[PDB]
């Protein structure tokens, strides 16, 4: 049952799908009844009860395949916590925009943009696909 | 090449000392002779303030900042010309 | 110029720039394929409880994954080098124009016949006229004749700069003591923007390039009035 | 000869997790603050 | 026996998601950020010359 | 107690003093170039000499006096030196690259020719030839020294080594003189730049190699070397050969082909 | 000269638990102390210099 | 003459390695041990100076993968990969 | 009674099936790209310059007042 | 990997304190410099 | 005791720890600088000041991340800790010199910080090109201090590389050939060879710049017949190999992480992985001018450098495929380390592929000196090198400390960083195709959107960095001591427990020659 | 080598009367590394080897590994158990399902 | 004369020698004619070319130097 730090050089127990039979038994010290059970196991296994069969399994192994292979709810904690700290990050960006950043250039004002946009079209910026191609120079509007 | 001599039977200390006194040092005495002969001050050339020479983009960290480290008055003009 | 939210290349203004759009498309396809193939296989390997942990043999599958990528490289190189050698073909220019980089503006020299030269400086944001582009407008534009083969010679009189105009597929570094050549040829009239493309000190971000492409006849009159 | 084993093969102490918090904070905090304060310094020169 | 994720899993997920979306939506739209989207389809060109 | 043949070095303060002395030399050069003062430099140079002296002192203690250099430790040291020389050769490569870059495509500023206009090169058949014979000779005399040491001949080992060092010193003096006589300087454009910096780093290495041969000389005087175990001498002799080879390339490149 | 290696071997092998840098006796300590004082002194000095050079004059 | 020999002047571990080699021994593990048949009755004898030593097993010639495990004083142990046998032979040097 | 199922090479068999799938998708996507991006791009350029009148384009620009050299 | 239970367990409350303190050691000084950028720029 | 242990060390594990600590601190400095970068660019306008202060920040960001964070952690930390263990060696060949490799770095770092303190800093780019780096456009101590910093960092790595090469050639068990060493050990030696050959060339280059600045040489000055372009050749002759130096140890740790969490006893195609690293190592020496496609070189030269640069994809391809083939049929353990490794495999491939776009000189005319280059290199550095460091760090933390991390917290840290770096760098592809140049403090208005998003992404990244400190704290505060570790039969470094004793392999392993 | 030769090698392997505990474990741990669920005849020889080494738990553990090696092919395990029923009955080996060890 | 034609001796992106060579050519030609009592106008081509190609500051710096005695080129 109880594993110690300074036992690192000795064979150990592991529950792994691809290592079904570990180097040692899960339980190495047996009580009086456990000893009796290991003796009984030398006889026909048909004489072993369900509870005794289970008990022998548990001396040899720690978890069953179904146990070691079980899925968890950890993903909820990871994804949820991720989103939380990504959430936290917007608090920083809010603070930054309030206290650090001054106003942006006057060239983003609505009217400035309207005029600059006209000019871009007058100069046929990206006339093949990018920009002006998306303006109808006849109906005088953005292509629907 | 194989040079023009011989030994090779065994390359040991005696051979290498033979080479030291019989070939190497004699070559050095020859080139010492040749040199202490073709030497003697060659007439310094006319000064011309060429722009790719006597460079100064920052003064030197010694003397008056305008003299090269192993400045020789006889042969090394300053950016303005030879010295007095 | 670039427009808001732009994803890809500025529209081609020269035949060479068109050529690069197609080559980029061809390459990006290969790039999407292989990265999506890798992403896919990754997910394939991680989605089964079936296992096989014993030693696997490598000297057979290593052939495929050596020969395929080699082939795909050759399929990128072929068009890559074709365009490269095209960009180098002899072309016989009708006009030579020089540009000197300075901290922090460009000067132009049109010295085939007369001695024409001027400085080109970024319009300060506070002096932009309505609808003019922040950081991009210059006081004296680079008037050039459209539909003609021009020779652009580029150099610098202080630190490195680099003369770029993305819509024409141009970027020639400007190095003091050296004279770099490139050829320019706009298929269209108009205004074509670019920005200094080598870190050059305090105002590297603020020394743009505006080309004005008008007909020969308007270029000649402009030249004259500019003497 | 020296101490060996968890918490003993390092030049900082992990005996008290709060004193350790304070150390780590000084250590990672000083590193992250340095550029901000060099910027400040450069803006207050000219 | 239930661990942290069996006890708190659904809550961490639900409120982490809720909070994330709330504060990003608020930052994206209420504090005066300029996103500079394409004029195409949104801006009416105005006379400049 | 260990059962491998490798050396577990006692904790040492020399890495730290060598590091700090590096900080003082570089910091000192900065203070010299920009703040007209040499104090820092003087200090860093002093500690560096002290560091180098104590650190190699201890290597001698650990090897000759304490016996820690088993054939395996010795074999590690051969690799370390081979690798060290390799990195030194690449360093010189940078400077040859610079010479060949400038001299093969001379710019308009120099008159578009090599040597540049207004530059009058030394005659490669004069002191440069002498210097060459001096180095080539010292290569012979150090081989003689190696064979003497291996044949257990104390007197002729010391005699050949002496000769080797004196040649080393002669080269240095000749080169010092030539430096002073040269009508061109380091400020004489790319010609002066490539010339003095390449040969000047070479001359630095001739000084280092020489110093190292001298150390070998005194260790031999005190019987440190056995006819079979003498890695310090081997190192110095490899290094000395590297130095001779670098000179043959400078000679052929800059003095002969470059004139 | 006479071969005195064996004495030096005796001296440096002597079981006194002293690190090789100090094993030669009292001179080692002096020289160590001088080295390390110049190093730590000079470093303090360089910091001062850096502080000086950080501001305009 | 005049130049010491290793015989006269080698000291410390250098001398130890040199003397031991002359008697044909390897106390300092400079040589790679030769394998036995590695059976139960012919296990590879692994010298040690404590009660356990790490063994590296190159199961088949030219494997690039080396199988590592602690070999303890006691009954022979087998390579977890190829089952060959090794037995610790403690002490001395 | 149940029939003997397949018990050997399940992983390899699974690998075979999906790599062939990944190939098929790749060709399917190549097709798509070289239609939705590549050809779309070549055709837009070819269509734009087919009957493109540069003097007319210039004139519209000139009349909009964008030019320094041409009023 | 297997390990033993924490020799000195760190409760949620304690983790909150450590998280908070950690964030604040990165955030406060940079915040302070950034907030005062304007008073630096023209001074 | 303390001073003898930590200032006078001769112990490869202690020195490795000094390095991890140095690197972690540098990593913080480098993160600050990068946030300065994205703060300035997070909205249109000027935040700090002109391009001088901005480029001082950009320049230090690079020098710090490369020479103080990546190289020290990878070669100094993981290299010293693991390499001796992996070959059953008692220490490094030159444990004393190894300590000086360490102690040269704080002084070197001091000189970098100094240079930014005096005058107006070195706003030159990490490439330090003249004439901008020269005594006229960058007058005073700043650039000289930067050069000296590089000298010290360079001596440090060159001495490091000599140690590693000698240790790996000379100190394996007598029965182990070079073809029985793990791939991390291989990756470290090939990196060491690259360091040994390339740093002295950089040394020569920056010394020439030093003398041009202070002794009136004219290596890069046309007035004396020099050539600014020559400098570029010398720098890049080192500069390209340098990137392979930054990624190779990465590849090594990826191989171990992927093998381990795949429940596999060995990596697929070992000899093909060895061949691959050597090839990348060699090819990486004949391609430097791909950093110079716009300086005006002959078309034949640009054709050679385009082709030689592309060929590097073959060997790199073999590695990527082999890592997948290692996962194939694995018993997959979804640890934090394995998540970093998976992320690495994919993101590195993307950065690698955009590196191939840039190999084409034709296209590069338009891509050079724009954010397209910046996106390529952060994929392979912020999502390549850094992802290998994170994976290796969480994987091996328990060996180094004897304590375990909270797996769940570490999975959270990975998710946050994953979102962060992708949001920072993906949109930079857009900025670059559309023409945003490098090394700009402000940009034309059209580029505002991608710069806003990319800055928001850098903040997410900040959050992950802060969280990481906390996670390292929690581990040391809770003290969950390591018991058992699986797969020790093919992971020698774990076989002496956690942490291994000060002295290990006092009695060397026994390995039969057969 | 052919499929039948493979199976035979493994049958013979587990059938060695004096097979010890280490060989039992080695054989099972090796076998599960392959891309197959072992044929019933192989599993039978290993179960009986469990009998001769008085190891009931390893017999159950072995049935579990068969199930595991089938991954999502839910049809393999019930076929294998069906083919081993005489053997299970003869030795009194309960299935993991019968022992309750298949429930998480 | 429109501009300096393609010159097969200088086919690459670096045109520095092209400028330099024609500058030298013109001034050597000018010297030869002004020596031998001849017309400088034969030299005209080279002046047009070098004027097309060479930066103003280069030409101006080189003219000042010829006047000063410090022109490193051989004329
Ligand atoms: C963050 C900002 C996003 C903004 C989106 C666009 C707005 C639409 C407007 C409206 C869009 C429609 C109209 C405009 C068409 C313009 C066409 C053009 O000019 O053409 C060229 C343009 C356009 O290219 C595109 O067409 C965009 C492709 C975007 C790829 C999507 C992967 C994104 C993954 C998940 C989210 C992103 C963050 C994660 C990044 C992960 C790294 C890939 O520019 C590029 O070249 C950028 C790509 C750089 C190369 C990276 C290559 C490898 C990528 C990764 C493979 C993942 C495979 C699996 C799939 C990946 C699943 C994980
Ligand atoms: C860890 C760092 C790292 C790595 C590993 C690389 C790898 C590559 N790099 Fe990059 N790079 C940097 C870090 C790196 N780089 C940095 C900092 C800079 C800019 C320097 C500066 O200017 O400041 C930079 C700059 C830079 C430039 C100059 C661009 C410019 O400035 O204009 C170029 C150009 O060729 C370049 C190209 C390449 C290429 C081909 C590779 C290749 O090695 C990558 C190959 C990998 C793959 C291809 C992916 C996997 C392969 C397959 C799945 C098989 C199939 C593939 C095909 C068939 C294509 N890099
Ligand atoms: C390894 C190298 C590296 C790394 C990791 C980064 C990381 C980042 N870089 Fe860096 N960058 C460069 C190297 C690097 N960069 C280089 C070389 C340049 C070009 C310089 C020049 O032009 O001259 C550059 C340029 C550059 C620019 C262009 C500047 C311009 O052209 O104007 C930008 C802009 O956004 C940017 C941003 C970032 C950001 C936001 C990160 C973030 O992703 C960072 C988030 C933080 C980390 C990823 C830290 C990780 C590790 C630790 C903290 C150690 C932890 C400790 C242990 C495990 C022990 N970078
Ligand atoms: C006799 C031959 C032996 C040479 C050594 C002699 C002593 C001088 C001092 C140290 C030389 C050390 C290394 C070489 C570095 C600089 C070039 C020196 C070569 C030299 O000595 O050239 C001299 C110029 O010296 C000058 O500027 C002198 C400048 C003196 C200060 C040295 C500059 C310090 C910067 C050194 C760089 C260090 C970086 C190396 C890093 C190592 C790798 C990490 C030539 O003199 P001149 O008057 O111009 O012409 C003679 C005309 N009559
Ligand atoms: C790129 C990385 C940057 C990350 C973003 C930083 C995130 C949050 C920073 C918080 O810290 C600060 O917040 C303040 C308030 O919000 C400040 O107080 C200032 O503000 C006050 C109130 O407005 C006064 O009480 C004080 O005098 C004070 O100087 C200031 O000191 C600073 O420490
Ligand atoms: Cu000029 Cu940047
Ligand atoms: O350098 O990529
Ligand atoms: Cu490169
Ligand atoms: Mg560039
Ligand atoms: Na800005
Ligand atoms: Zn074996």
Nearest residue on chain B to K214, alpha-carbon basis: B58
Which residue of K38, K43, K459 sits with most ligand 5 atoms within 8 Å of its CB, as the best mutation to test the pocket?
K459
The DSSP output letter for L103 is -
- Report the alpha-carbon distance of residue I11 to residue K329 in Å, rounded: 7
Looking at the structure, tell me whether residues C87 and C107 fall in a common domain. no
Which residue of A85, A91, A95, A101 sits with most ligand 5 atoms within 8 Å of its CB, as the best mutation to test the pocket?
A95
- Dihedral sign for Cα F46, F50, F55, F57, please: positive
Chains L and A touch (3+ CB pairs under 8 A): yes
CB C46 within 8 A of CB K345: no
**Does residue J30 have its Cβ closer than 6 Å to ligand 5?**
yes
Between the alpha carbon of residue M51 and those of residues C179, K399, L53, the distances in Å are 14, 73, 102
- Report the alpha-carbon distance of residue C98 to residue C181 in Å, rounded: 9
Write out the DSSP string of C163-217. EEEGGGTEEEEE-BT--EEEEE--SS-EEEEE---S--STTGGG--EEEEEE-HH
CATH of the domain at E23: 4.10.51.10
Residues of K in contact with F69 (CB under 8 A): none
CB F149 within 8 A of CB F233: yes
Nearest residue on chain H to F224, alpha-carbon basis: H4
Topology (CATH) of L1-104: 1.25.40
CA F258 to chain centre: 23
Looking at the structure, tell me whether residues C78 and C124 fall in a common domain. no
Of all protein residues, whose CA lies closest to atom 17 belonging to ligand 4? Answer: F197
Between the alpha carbon of residue G39 and those of residues F41, G19, K102, K173, the distances in Å are 12, 20, 17, 40
- Report the alpha-carbon distance of residue C57 to residue K322 in Å, rounded: 11
Q: Which residues pair with C109 in a beta bridge?
A: C98, C117
- Report the alpha-carbon distance of residue L89 to residue L86 in Å, rounded: 5
**Does residue J33 have its Cβ closer than 6 Å to ligand 5?**
no
Report the residue numbers after which chain L has a gap, meaning the C atom sits over 2.5 angstroms from the next written residue's N, or none.
Answer: none
CB K268 within 8 A of CB K338: no
The response to whether C102 counts as a known ligand-binding position is no
Resolution, angstroms, 1 dp: 2.5
Contact across the interface for H9 and G13, Cβ inside 8 Å: no
Topology (CATH) of D1-46: Cytochrome C Oxidase; Chain L (4.10.49)
Residues of G in contact with D45 (CB under 8 A): 55-56
Compute the CA torsion angle F176, F178, F181, F184 (nearest 10 deg): -110
Q: Which of C123, C150, C133, C132 is nearest to C214 (CA)?
A: C150
The residue with tokens 């790319």 is F190
- E7 close contact with A: CB closer than 8 A: no
Tell me which H or E stretch contains C97: strand C95-102
Q: CB-based contacts of C198: which residues, under 8 Å, 6+ apart?
A: C160, C161, C162, C173, C174, C204, K129, K369
Instruction: State the count of interchain CB pairs (< 8 A) between I and L.
Output: 32
Nearest residue on chain K to C45, alpha-carbon basis: K328
Residue C40 φ/ψ, nearest 5 degrees = -65, -60
Given the residues K61, K172, K213, K429, the one annotated as active site: K61
CB F196 within 8 A of CB B71: no
Q: Which of K313, K341, K383, K340 is nearest to K255 (CA)?
A: K341
Q: Which CATH architecture has domain H1-93?
A: Sandwich (2.60)
Q: How far, in Å, is the centroid of ligand 7 from the Cα of K243?
A: 6
Ligand number, closest to the Cα atom of K357? 2
Per the structure, the complete domain to which residue E20 belongs is given by 1-49
Angle (CA) F225-F230-F233 rounded to 5° is: 105
The DSSP output letter for H70 is E
Write out the DSSP string of F71-91. HHHHHHHHHHHHHHHHHHHHH
Q: CB-based contacts of K371: which residues, under 8 Å, 6+ apart?
A: K428, K429, K431, K432, K436, K437, K438
CB L42 within 8 A of CB L10: yes
CB L60 within 8 A of CB L43: no
For chain I, the three-class secondary structure string (H helix, E strand, C coil) is CCCCCCCECHHHHHHHHHHHHHHHHHHHHHHHHHHHCHHHHHHHHHHHHHCCCHHHHHHHHHHHCCCCCCC
- Report the alpha-carbon distance of residue F211 to residue F229 in Å, rounded: 21
Domains of chain K: total? 1
Classify residue A52 as exposed, middle or buried by CB count within 10 Å of its CB (0-12, 13-18, 19+): middle
Chains K and G touch (3+ CB pairs under 8 A): yes
Q: Which of K49, A107, A116, A123 is nearest to C134 (CA)?
A: A107
Domain boundaries, chain L: 1-104
Contact across the interface for K477 and J30, Cβ inside 8 Å: no
Domains of chain J: 1-43 (4.10.81.10)
- Put the strands of the sheet holding H85-90 in their side by side order: H44-48, H85-90, H77-78
**H runs (alpha helix) in K222-268:** 228-261
Between the alpha carbon of residue K465 and those of residues A68, E25, K377, M54, the distances in Å are 33, 24, 20, 55
- Report the alpha-carbon distance of residue K200 to residue K202 in Å, rounded: 5
Residue H47 φ/ψ, nearest 5 degrees = -60, 150
Per the structure, the complete domain to which residue M70 belongs is given by 1-75
User: Is K438 known to be catalytic?
Assistant: yes
Q: Supply J19's token pair.
A: 């998280």
Q: How far, in Å, is the centroid of ligand 10 from the Cα of I34?
A: 39
Residue E29 φ/ψ, nearest 5 degrees = -130, -5
Of all protein residues, whose CA lies closest to atom 1 belonging to ligand 5? Answer: K35
Looking at the structure, tell me whether residues C113 and C185 fall in a common domain. yes
- H20 close contact with F: CB closer than 8 A: no
* Neighbouring residues of the ion ligand 8, judged by CB less than 5 Å: K 240
Given the residues K319, K395, K413, K429, the one annotated as active site: K319
The response to whether H8 counts as a known ligand-binding position is no
Residues of F with CB under 8 A from a CB of H: 1, 3-5, 65-72, 149, 152-155, 157, 223, 225-229
Between the alpha carbon of residue E34 and those of residues F71, K44, K452, the distances in Å are 72, 9, 9
Between the alpha carbon of residue M58 and those of residues D27, F117, M52, M64, the distances in Å are 56, 18, 12, 10
The DSSP output letter for L69 is T
Q: Which CATH superfamily, name and number, covers G1-57?
A: Cytochrome c oxidase, subunit VIIa (4.10.91.10)
Three-class SS state of H85: strand
User: Is K12 known to be catalytic?
Assistant: no
Topology (CATH) of A1-144: Cytochrome C Oxidase; Chain D (1.10.442)
Three-class SS state of K112: helix
CB K289 within 8 A of CB K305: yes
Q: Supply C177's token pair.
A: 């003591």
- Report the alpha-carbon distance of residue F135 to residue F205 in Å, rounded: 13
Contact across the interface for A122 and I45, Cβ inside 8 Å: no
Per the structure, the complete domain to which residue C14 belongs is given by 2-91
- M20 close contact with F: CB closer than 8 A: yes
**Does residue A95 have its Cβ closer than 6 Å to ligand 5?**
yes
- K114 close contact with J: CB closer than 8 A: no
Q: Which of H70, K170, K145, J30 is nearest to D33 (CA)?
A: J30
Tell me which H or E stretch contains G20: none
Per the structure, the complete domain to which residue I41 belongs is given by 1-71
- Max CA separation in chain C (angstroms): 83
Three-class SS state of H48: strand
Domain boundaries, chain A: 1-144
């Amino acid at each position: 049952s109880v594993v110690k730090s300074e036992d690192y050089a000795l064979p150990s127990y592991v529950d792994r799908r691809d290592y079904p039979l570990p180097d040692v038994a899960h339980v190495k010290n047996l009580s009086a009844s456990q000893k009796a059970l290991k003796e009984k196991e030398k006889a026909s296994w048909s004489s072993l009860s369900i509870d005794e069969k289970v008990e022998l399994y548990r001396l040899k192994f720690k978890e069953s395949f179904a146990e070691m292979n079980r899925s968890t709810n950890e993903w909820k904690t990871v994804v949820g916590a991720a989103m939380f700290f990504i959430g936290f990050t917007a608090l920083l960006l809010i603070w930054e925009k309030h206290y650090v950043y001054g106003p942006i250039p006057h060239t983003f004002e609505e009217e400035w943009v309207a005029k600059q946009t006209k000019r871009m079209l007058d100069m046929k910026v990206a006339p093949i696909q990018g920009f002006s191609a998306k303006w109808d120079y006849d109906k005088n509007e953005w292509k629907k | 090449a194989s040079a023009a001599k011989g030994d090779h039977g065994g390359t040991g200390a005696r051979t290498w000392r033979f080479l030291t006194f019989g070939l190497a040092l004699p070559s050095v005495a020859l080139c010492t002779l040749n040199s202490w002969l073709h030497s003697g001050h060659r007439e310094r050339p006319a000064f011309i303030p060429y722009h790719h020479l006597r460079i100064r983009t920052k003064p030197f960290s010694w003397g008056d900042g305008n003299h090269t480290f192993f400045h020789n008055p006889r042969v090394n003009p300053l950016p303005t010309g030879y010295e007095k | 110029m670039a427009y808001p939210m732009q994803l890809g290349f500025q529209d081609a203004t020269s035949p060479i720039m068109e050529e690069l759009l197609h080559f980029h498309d061809h390459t990006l396809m290969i790039v999407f394929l292989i990265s999506s193939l890798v992403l896919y296989i990754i997910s394939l390997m991680l989605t089964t409880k079936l296992t096989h942990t014993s030693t696997m043999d490598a000297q057979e599958v290593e052939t495929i994954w050596t020969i395929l990528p080699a082939i795909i490289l050759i399929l990128i190189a072929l068009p890559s080098l074709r365009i490269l050698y095209m960009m180098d073909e002899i072309n016989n220019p009708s006009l030579t124009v020089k540009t000197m980089g300075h901290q922090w503006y460009w000067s132009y020299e049109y010295t085939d016949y007369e001695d024409l030269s001027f400085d080109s400086y970024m319009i300060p944001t506070s002096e932009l006229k309505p609808g003019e582009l922040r950081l991009l407008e210059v006081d004296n534009r680079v008037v050039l004749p459209m539909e003609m083969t021009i020779r652009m010679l580029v150099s610098s009189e202080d630190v490195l700069h680099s003369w770029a105009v993305p819509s024409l597929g141009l970027k020639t570094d400007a190095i003091p003591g050296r004279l770099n050549q490139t050829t320019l040829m706009s298929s269209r009239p108009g205004l074509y923007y670019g920005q200094c493309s080598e870190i050059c000190g305090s105002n590297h971000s603020f020394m743009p390039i505006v080309l004005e492409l008008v007909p020969l006849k308007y270029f000649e009159k402009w030249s004259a009035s500019m003497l | 000869h020296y101490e060996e084993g968890p918490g003993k093969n390092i030049p900082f102490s992990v005996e008290n997790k709060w004193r350790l918090l304070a150390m780590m904070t000084l250590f990672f905090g000083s590193g992250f603050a340095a550029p901000f304060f060099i910027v400040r310094h450069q803006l207050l020169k000219k | 026996a239930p661990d942290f994720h069996d006890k708190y899993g659904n809550a961490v997920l639900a409120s982490g998601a809720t909070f994330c979306v709330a504060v990003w939506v608020y930052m994206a739209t209420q504090i005066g950020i300029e996103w500079n989207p394409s004029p195409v389809g949104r801006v009416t060109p105005k006379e400049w010359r | 107690h260990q059962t491998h043949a490798y050396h577990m070095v006692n904790p040492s303060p020399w890495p730290l003093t060598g590091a700090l002395s590096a900080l003082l030399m570089t910091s000192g050069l900065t203070m010299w170039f920009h703040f007209n003062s040499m104090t820092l430099l003087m200090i860093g140079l002093t500690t560096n000499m002290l560091t180098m002296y104590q650190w190699w002192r201890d290597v001698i203690r650990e090897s000759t006096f304490q016996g820690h250099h088993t054939p395996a430790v010795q074999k590690g040291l051969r690799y370390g030196m081979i690798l060290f020389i390799i990195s030194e050769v690449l360093f010189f490569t940078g400077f040859f690259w610079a010479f060949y870059h400038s001299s093969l495509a001379p710019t308009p500023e120099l008159g578009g020719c090599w040597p540049p206009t207004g530059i009058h090169p030394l005659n490669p058949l004069e002191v440069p030839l002498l210097n060459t014979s001096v180095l080539l000779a010292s290569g012979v005399s150090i081989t003689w020294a190696h064979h003497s040491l291996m044949e257990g001949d104390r007197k002729h080992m010391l005699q050949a080594l002496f000769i080797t060092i004196t040649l080393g010193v002669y080269f240095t003096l000749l080169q010092a003189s030539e430096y002073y006589e040269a009508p061109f300087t380091i400020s004489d454009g790319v010609y002066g730049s490539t010339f003095f910096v390449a040969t000047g780093f070479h001359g630095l290495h001739v000084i280092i190699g020489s110093t190292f041969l001298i150390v070998c000389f005194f260790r031999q005087l005190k019987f440190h070397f056995t006819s079979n175990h003498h890695f310090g001498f081997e190192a110095a002799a490899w290094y000395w050969h590297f130095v001779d080879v670098v000179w043959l390339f400078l000679y052929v490149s800059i003095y002969w082909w470059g004139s | 000269f006479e071969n005195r290696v064996a004495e030096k071997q005796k001296l440096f092998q002597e079981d006194n638990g002293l690190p090789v840098h100090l094993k030669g006796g009292a001179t080692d300590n002096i020289l160590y102390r001088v080295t390390m004082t110049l190093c730590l002194g000079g470093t303090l000095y360089s910091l001062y210099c850096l502080g000086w050079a950080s501001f305009p004059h | 003459g005049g130049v010491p020999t290793d015989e006269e002047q080698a000291t410390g571990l250098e001398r130890e390695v040199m003397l031991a080699a002359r008697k044909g021994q390897d106390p300092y593990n400079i040589l790679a041990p030769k394998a036995t048949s590695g059976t139960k009755e012919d296990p590879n004898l692994v010298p040690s100076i404590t009660n356990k030593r790490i063994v590296g097993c190159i199961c088949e010639e030219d494997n690039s993968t080396v199988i590592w495990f602690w070999l303890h004083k006691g009954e022979a142990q087998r390579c977890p990969s190829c089952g060959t046998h090794y037995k610790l032979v403690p002490h001395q040097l | 009674a149940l029939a003997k199922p397949q018990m050997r090479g399940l992983l390899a068999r699974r690998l075979r099936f999906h790599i062939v799938g990944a190939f098929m998708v790749s060709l399917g996507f190549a097709t798509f790209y070289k239609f939705a991006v590549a050809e779309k791009r070549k055709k837009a350029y070819a269509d734009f310059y087919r009957n493109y009148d540069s003097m007319k384009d210039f004139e519209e620009m000139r009349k909009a007042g964008i030019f320094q050299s041409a009023k | 990997i297997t390990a033993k239970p924490a020799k000195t367990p760190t409760s949620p409350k304690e983790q909150a304190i450590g998280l908070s303190v950690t964030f604040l050691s990165f955030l406060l000084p940079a915040g302070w410099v950034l907030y005062h950028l304007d008073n630096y720029k023209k001074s | 005791m303390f001073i003898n242990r930590w200032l006078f060390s001769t112990n490869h594990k202690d020195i490795g720890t000094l390095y991890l600590l140095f690197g972690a601190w540098a990593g913080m400095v480098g993160t600050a600088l990068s946030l300065l970068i994205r703060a300035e660019l997070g909205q249109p306008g000027t935040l700090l000041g002109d391009d001088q202060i901005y480029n001082v920040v950009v320049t230090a960001h690079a020098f710090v991340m490369i020479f103080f964070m990546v190289m020290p952690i990878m070669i100094g930390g993981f290299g010293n800790w693991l390499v001796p263990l992996m070959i059953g060696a008692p220490d490094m060949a030159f444990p004393r010199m190894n300590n000086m490799s360490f102690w040269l770095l704080p002084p070197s770092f001091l000189l970098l910080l100094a240079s930014s303190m005096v005058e107006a800093g070195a706003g030159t780019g990490w490439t330090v090109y003249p004439p901008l780096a020269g005594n006229l456009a960058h007058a005073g101590a700043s650039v000289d201090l930067t050069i000296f910093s590089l000298h010290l960092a360079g001596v440090s790595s060159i001495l490091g590389a000599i140690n590693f090469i000698t240790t790996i050639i000379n100190m394996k068990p007598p029965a182990m050939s070079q073809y029985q060493t793990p791939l991390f050990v291989w990756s470290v030696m090939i990196t060491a060879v690259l360091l040994l050959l390339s740093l002295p060339v950089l040394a020569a280059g920056i010394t020439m710049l030093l003398t041009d600045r202070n002794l009136n040489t004219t290596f890069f000055d046309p007035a004396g017949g020099g050539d600014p372009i020559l400098y570029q050749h010398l720098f890049w002759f080192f500069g390209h190999p340098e990137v392979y130096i930054l990624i190779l140890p990465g590849f090594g740790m990826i191989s171990h992480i992927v093998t381990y969490y795949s429940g596999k006893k060995e990596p697929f195609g070992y000899m093909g992985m060895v061949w691959a690293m050597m090839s990348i190592g060699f090819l990486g020496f004949i391609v430097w001018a791909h950093h110079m496609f716009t300086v005006g070189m002959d078309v034949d030269t640009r054709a050679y450098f385009t082709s030689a640069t592309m060929i590097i994809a073959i060997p790199t391809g073999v590695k990527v495929f082999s890592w997948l083939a290692t996962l194939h049929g694995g018993n997959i353990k979804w640890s934090p380390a394995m998540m970093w490794a998976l992320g690495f495999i994919f993101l590195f491939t993307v950065g690698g592929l955009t590196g191939i776009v840039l190999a084409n000189s034709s296209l590069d005319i338009v891509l050079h000196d724009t954010y397209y280059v910046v996106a390529h290199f952060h994929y392979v550095l912020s999502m390549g090198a850094v992802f290998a460091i994170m994976g290796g760090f969480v994987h091996w933390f328990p060996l180094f400390s004897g304590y375990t991390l909270n797996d769940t917290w570490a999975k959270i840290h990975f998710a946050i960083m994953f979102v962060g770096v992708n949001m920072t760098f993906f949109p930079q592809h857009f900025l670059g195709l559309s023409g945003m140049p490098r090394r700009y403090s402000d940009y034309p208005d059209a580029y505002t959107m991608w710069n806003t998003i990319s800055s928001m992404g850098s903040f997410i990244s900040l959050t992950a960095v802060m969280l990481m400190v906390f996670i390292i704290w929690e581990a040391f505060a809770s003290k969950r001591e390591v018991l058992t570790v699986d797969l020790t039969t093919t992971n020698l470094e774990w076989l002496n427990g956690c942490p291994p004793p000060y002295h290990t392999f006092e009695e060397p392993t026994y390995v039969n020659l057969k | 080598e052919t499929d039948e030769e493979f199976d035979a090698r493994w049958v013979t392997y587990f059938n060695k009367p004096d097979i010890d505990a280490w060989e039992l474990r080695k054989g099972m741990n090796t076998l599960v590394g392959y891309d197959l669920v072992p044929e019933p005849k192989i599993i039978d020889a290993a179960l009986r080897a469990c009998r001769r080494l008085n190891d009931f738990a390893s017999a159950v553990r072995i049935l579990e590994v068969v199930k595991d090696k089938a991954g999502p092919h839910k049809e393999i395990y019930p076929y294998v158990i069906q083919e081993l029923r005489p053997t299970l009955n003869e030795l009194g080996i309960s299935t993991p399902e019968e022992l309750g060890l298949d429930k998480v | 004369y429109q501009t300096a034609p393609f010159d097969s001796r200088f086919p690459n992106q670096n045109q520095t020698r092209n400028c330099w060579q024609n500058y030298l050519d013109f001034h050597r030609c000018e010297k030869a004619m002004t020596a031998k009592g001849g017309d400088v106008s034969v030299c005209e081509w080279y002046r047009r070319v070098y004027k097309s190609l060479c930066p103003i500051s280069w030409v101006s710096t080189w003219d000042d130097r010829r006047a000063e005695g410090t022109f490193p080129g051989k004329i």
